[PDB]
Amino acid sequence: TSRNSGRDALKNNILAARTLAEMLRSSLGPKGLDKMLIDSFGDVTITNDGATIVKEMEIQHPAAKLLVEAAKAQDSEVGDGTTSAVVLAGLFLEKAESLVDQNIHPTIIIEGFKKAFNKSLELLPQLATKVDVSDLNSATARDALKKIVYTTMSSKFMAEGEELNKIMDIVIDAVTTVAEPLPDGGYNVSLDLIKIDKKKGGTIEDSQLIRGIVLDKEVVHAGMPRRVEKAKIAVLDASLEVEKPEISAKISITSPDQIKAFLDEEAKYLKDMVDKLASIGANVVICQKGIDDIAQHFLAKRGILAVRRVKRSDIEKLEKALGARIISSIKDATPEDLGYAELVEERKVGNDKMVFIEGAKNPKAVNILLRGSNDMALDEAERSINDALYSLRNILMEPYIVPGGGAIELELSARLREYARSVGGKEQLAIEAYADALEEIPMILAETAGLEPISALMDLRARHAKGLTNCGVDVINGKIIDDIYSINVVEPIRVTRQVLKSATEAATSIMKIDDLIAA
């Protein structure tokens, strides 16, 4: 029975978190290193994505399992920032151990890091830049939004991609349109109701928006119509297949006429169901479940276009964009649950059939068709559209931008080694150690990119002090570079705020934790 007391556990849980952190940090910055991760059934996985590397890995040390939940939540917000937050938690934790070493006590270290965080939060509206709510209907002149969706793409893929960024910028500007504004001055951004389909056999300039939903599923039957104009769409929850009685019996039959009459009873149940769809005035129908083969014959006879197995995600999207509030009971044929589209057709794209519903009054749910050559350039173009949207949801939900890893971090360190001077007690040691951790940002960027770190740090300090506090480094040209917003490299403020929060919350928790009793 392994027992523990006496700061013994804290040295074991700092050690696990430092080991997790200094392994994801070789895979941090834009020029860093990808890991390979092999699965139980042998599948190989290469990524530098740091919430993916923990996911693709069985986690053997309990302190490392807690740190992983912090990354998961952060990855839904910023899929780069979530690596960065794990390293930041780690670099916070080894200043916490130095302070323990000096005997400052973990509670006092916890309260001095929180007090450092409070100063950081009243410094992130002053030192940050606010670009305001609207340039001429949210996106005209574009600039500030243009800069963060370019910067994020340039950091997360590197090299040149100017003929990819302009199509992504247009695609982003159309998603920006969906979203609308408040006297909070952010935007209602629903990336949930956004849907992207990628199809071979074109080029990226050949991507387009649809103001309605596109369905991959089959119209399935030869007799059906394949294009509908001024389409009234029923979305149906229930199966288009007959339901058995409450209590019931079956027997084996030879005798072939009574088998034909069982079928003919079941066909007057499907033809009843169809008459109900057609009674509503339904021209299209969408069915979440199967549709029986007889019911498809009668839907084509009434001149009505059916789709089969439409997946769960596509049904919320089809609701929110057309107004179809979705029939529960075929029998009740419910009459106002009918939605509206300008047009509905089956189109071949990339040779695959696809049914496109388009022309929709005020949808929060649109579909983007993403064309390219074969597959690797298309997967890469989806990922680019994803990362750009996630950056857009941070600038939209707060119109503040800030540069990342060069200016802010150094200014926070210098204002804090002025704050800690007005601060007295064994609280000044925690504020000045929190500042030192900020200086551990900055010089690690220059080291992932293969530069000397201690000379880059000293040189950033010396230019920030005798020159100005806006300096940073250019990873693409790989050198120290004056006023980094003038170099056009900026982040949404919500990626800063959220990764400094999830680093001060997680490091506070490994200090806050002592005993361990295991079954």
* Shortest CB 133 distance to a second copy, Å: 23
The span from the CA of 75 to the CA of 49, in Å, is 10
Q: Site for a second copy (CB under 8 A): which residue of 126, 248, 351, 374? A: 248
Q: Site for a second copy (CB under 8 A): which residue of 36, 121, 170, 468? A: 36
Counting residues that bind a second copy (by CB under 8 A) gives 69
Which candidate in 52, 83, 151, 176 is catalytic? Answer: 83
> Which two three-digit tokens encode residue 197?
């389909």
Q: E-assigned strands of 33-154? A: 35-38, 44-47, 129-130
Of 85 and 294, CB closest to a second copy? 294
Under the binding rule (CB under 8 A), the answer on residue 40 touching a second copy is yes
Q: Site for a second copy (CB under 8 A): which residue of 55, 426, 463, 501? A: 426
Q: In the stretch 226-245, what mask flags binding to a second copy with x, by CB under 8 A?
A: -------------------x
Q: In the stretch 5-24, what mask flags binding to a second copy with x, by CB under 8 A?
A: x---x-------------x-
Of 141 and 247, CB closest to a second copy? 247
Under the binding rule (CB under 8 A), the answer on residue 57 touching a second copy is yes
* Shortest CB 99 distance to a second copy, Å: 10
- Is residue 82 flagged as an active site residue? yes
Of 386 and 509, CB closest to a second copy? 509
- Is residue 83 flagged as an active site residue? yes
Under the binding rule (CB under 8 A), the answer on residue 261 touching a second copy is no
Question: Which parts of 322-381 interact with a second copy (CB under 8 A)?
Answer: 328-329
The span from the CA of 211 to the CA of 445, in Å, is 42
Q: For every residue of 162-222, which 3-state class applies, written as one string?
A: HHHHHHHHHHHHHHHHHCCECCCCCECCCCCCCEEEEECCCCHHHCEEECCCEECCCCCCC
145 contacts 139 by C-beta, under 8 angstroms: yes
307 contacts 355 by C-beta, under 8 angstroms: yes
Write out the H or E segment, with its range, that includes residue 401.
strand 400-402
Under the binding rule (CB under 8 A), the answer on residue 76 touching a second copy is no
Q: Which window, 130-138, 142-150, 406-414, 422-430, contacts a second copy (CB under 8 A)?
A: 422-430
- Is residue 49 flagged as an active site residue? yes
40 contacts 476 by C-beta, under 8 angstroms: no
* Shortest CB 351 distance to a second copy, Å: 13
Q: Site for a second copy (CB under 8 A): which residue of 108, 193, 209, 480? A: 108
* Shortest CB 262 distance to a second copy, Å: 7
> Which two three-digit tokens encode residue 341?
């589209």
Q: Site for a second copy (CB under 8 A): which residue of 2, 52, 53, 386? A: 53
The span from the CA of 98 to the CA of 101, in Å, is 5
Q: For every residue of 309-327, which 3-state class applies, written as one string?
A: CCCHHHHHHHHHHHCCCCE
Q: Site for a second copy (CB under 8 A): which residue of 145, 395, 429, 471? A: 429
- Is residue 334 flagged as an active site residue? no
Q: Which window, 127-135, 248-256, 339-347, 480-488, contacts a second copy (CB under 8 A)?
A: 248-256
* Shortest CB 107 distance to a second copy, Å: 5
Long-range contacts of 165-174 (CB under 8 A, 24+ apart): 167/204, 167/205, 167/207, 168/381, 168/384, 168/385, 168/388, 169/142, 171/207, 171/209, 171/368, 171/385, 171/388, 172/145, 172/385, 172/388, 172/389, 172/392, 173/139, 173/142, 174/209, 174/366, 174/368
Q: Site for a second copy (CB under 8 A): which residue of 125, 335, 450, 467? A: 450
Cα torsion 413, 416, 421, 426: sign: negative
DSSP, collapsed to helix, strand or coil, labels residue 516 as coil
Question: Residue 233's closest CA among 146, 307, 157?
Answer: 307
Instruction: Give strand pairing partners of 35.
Output: 47
Q: Site for a second copy (CB under 8 A): which residue of 165, 384, 413, 448? A: 448
Question: Which parts of 115-174 interact with a second copy (CB under 8 A)?
Answer: none
Which candidate in 52, 82, 152, 504 is catalytic? Answer: 82
393 contacts 158 by C-beta, under 8 angstroms: no
Q: Which window, 33-41, 188-196, 225-233, 312-320, contacts a second copy (CB under 8 A)?
A: 33-41
Lookup result for tokens 């027992």: 3
Question: Residue 472's closest CA among 155, 121, 90, 18?
Answer: 155
Of 269 and 485, CB closest to a second copy? 269
Q: Site for a second copy (CB under 8 A): which residue of 8, 11, 33, 134? A: 33
The residues that touch a second copy, with contacts defined as CB under 8 A, are: 5, 9, 23, 26-27, 31, 33-40, 44, 46, 53, 57-58, 62, 65-66, 102-108, 222, 245-251, 253-256, 259-260, 262-263, 293, 328-329, 424-426, 428-429, 448-450, 452, 454-455, 458, 509, 512-519
By annotation, the residues acting in catalysis are: 49, 82-83, 387
